[PDB]
Design an enzyme around this catalytic site. Structure first.
Site, PDB file in Angstrom:
ATOM      1  CG  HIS A  52      -1.618  -1.294   1.453  1.00 36.13           C
ATOM      2  ND1 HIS A  52      -2.714  -1.728   0.746  1.00 36.13           N
ATOM      3  CD2 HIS A  52      -1.328  -2.282   2.340  1.00 36.13           C
ATOM      4  CE1 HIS A  52      -3.083  -2.922   1.190  1.00 36.13           C
ATOM      5  NE2 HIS A  52      -2.258  -3.276   2.160  1.00 36.13           N
ATOM      6  CG  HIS A  82       7.776   4.008   3.249  1.00 39.13           C
ATOM      7  ND1 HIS A  82       8.888   3.670   3.985  1.00 39.13           N
ATOM      8  CD2 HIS A  82       6.757   4.132   4.135  1.00 39.13           C
ATOM      9  CE1 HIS A  82       8.551   3.579   5.260  1.00 39.13           C
ATOM     10  NE2 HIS A  82       7.266   3.849   5.374  1.00 39.13           N
ATOM     11  CG  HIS A  92       7.462   7.196   7.180  1.00 38.89           C
ATOM     12  ND1 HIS A  92       6.523   6.282   7.613  1.00 38.89           N
ATOM     13  CD2 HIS A  92       7.132   8.378   7.753  1.00 38.89           C
ATOM     14  CE1 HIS A  92       5.668   6.887   8.420  1.00 38.89           C
ATOM     15  NE2 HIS A  92       6.011   8.158   8.519  1.00 38.89           N
ATOM     16  CB  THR A 142       3.312   3.328  11.164  1.00 41.46           C
ATOM     17  OG1 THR A 142       3.827   3.300   9.838  1.00 41.46           O
ATOM     18  CG2 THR A 142       4.180   4.252  11.990  1.00 41.46           C
ATOM     19  CG  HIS A 182       2.672   6.358   5.542  1.00 40.47           C
ATOM     20  ND1 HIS A 182       1.990   5.256   6.000  1.00 40.47           N
ATOM     21  CD2 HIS A 182       3.980   6.013   5.521  1.00 40.47           C
ATOM     22  CE1 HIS A 182       2.850   4.290   6.269  1.00 40.47           C
ATOM     23  NE2 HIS A 182       4.062   4.724   5.979  1.00 40.47           N
TER      24      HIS A 182
HETATM   25 CL   LIG Z   1       4.145  10.519   9.241  1.00 38.83          CL
HETATM   26 ZN   LIG Z   2       5.884   4.301   6.891  1.00 37.12          ZN
END
Ligand SMILES: [Cl-]
Ligand SMILES: [Zn+2]
Ligand SMILES: [Cl-]
Ligand SMILES: [Zn+2]
Lengths: 224, 217
Positions: free
Chosen positions: A62, A87, A106, A168, A89
């Protein structure tokens, strides 16, 4: 039983249920992300970032990920950490004082022992971001991937909340060193939208997790 | 049944003893640890302590323990953790900048959400300490007098130092040592059966520790 952020049988509410590796997603007392409301001000951290070509730019679990050859580093308290990937989010996963950004990146790092130092910075809608270029273009082709301006990627002078948390996303491994950077970068609404598009227009934001009086410091450093 | 011996039922083997204790090994924020690197701050702790008669004074699981009615509290960040007991360790389980102490007390608290807040203070053999006596002979305990008026503490996120080694524990570790007399030191330690109940220092995944100061009264 493949995990996702969809509110069905396979969401975050139930990651702990999908495999026994994921149990620490519910049993863990240092889970990420959280709301950065309460922290301590203070006075260690060194950036070795050279513009690099990704070893690959891809959609996985994802997220949109760029991986690198282990030529880049972060040094925190004499201990050394290499950048493995960057990556994304959407929306941002950590919240600074209950403010949400539309996107965050990240910068995951590892040492030889496999300990993680992850670096979070958020994005807001506005000016076009040069630095996103090779990632948006690199994702359309498996290419001789153009370089990413890592040394130029995040602000020269920076303010952050450092604390220990967890991954996470499953398996939600703890012991992770989080540096969440207050100042957001800006991103074109088109830029932002195809990132979202390239992460299958489906949000990959884990819900804030139970916070057990996490000791957070807010501090400063220079990233150039 | 878990122990502190370097044999088969010991700290390096606690997780193996039950499934609940498996965090003792697998945890990424276990206690005790050595407090060497930390941040400094200039910014929240309110003590509601009172001389309190112990609901019970007993030995359980290698420690000397005094339990209390839920009448004493500590306020941290708008929450109120209530005191349940104080127990002792010999030697002192936590280390500050490598320094060791012969004994320590832990003041154990719980909030509305069950979250733990534990306070540790170190002792040094010196003058007879009055506050031990009500415990040692067992008398109300002068909780209000027990701790220094002014403290430098270390605050961080760890765990219980004994099985089941649960995490999410808010530790406050006070730099300033209290005093204890050798007559107190012998007697209390021998109530602990001359078996040192000090868990070894655990791995430290870069624990974010702050140095601060406060008034306990
Ligand atoms: Cl974040
Ligand atoms: Zn992450
Ligand atoms: Cl201690
Ligand atoms: Zn204890």
């Amino acid at each position: 039983t493949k995990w996702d952020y969809k509110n069905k049988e396979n969401g975050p509410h139930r990651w702990d249920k999908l495999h026994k590796d994921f149990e620490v997603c519910k049993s863990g007392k240092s889970q990420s992300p959280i709301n950065i409301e309460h922290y301590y001000h203070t006075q260690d951290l060194q950036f070795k970032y050279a513009a690099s070509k990704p070893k690959a730019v891809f959609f996985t679990h994802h997220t949109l990920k760029a991986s690198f050859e282990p030529t880049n580093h972060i040094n925190y308290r004499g201990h050394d950490y290499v950048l493995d990937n960057v990556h994304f989010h959407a929306p941002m996963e950590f919240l600074i004082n209950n403010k949400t950004r539309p996107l965050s990146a990240h910068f995951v790092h590892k040492d030889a022992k496999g300990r993680l130092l992850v670096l979070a910075i958020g994005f807001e809608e506005g000016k076009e971001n040069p630095n996103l270029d090779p990632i948006l273009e690199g994702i359309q082709k498996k290419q001789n991937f153009k370089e990413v301006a890592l040394d130029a990627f995040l602000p020269k002078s920076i303010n952050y909340y450092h604390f220990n948390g967890s991954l996470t996303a499953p398996p939600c491994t703890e012991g992770v060193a989080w540096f969440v950077i207050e100042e957001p970068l800006e991103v074109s609404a088109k830029q932002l939208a195809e990132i979202k598009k390239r992460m299958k227009n489906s949000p990959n934001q884990r819900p804030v997790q139970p916070d057990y009086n996490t000791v957070i410091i807010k501090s400063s450093a220079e990233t150039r």
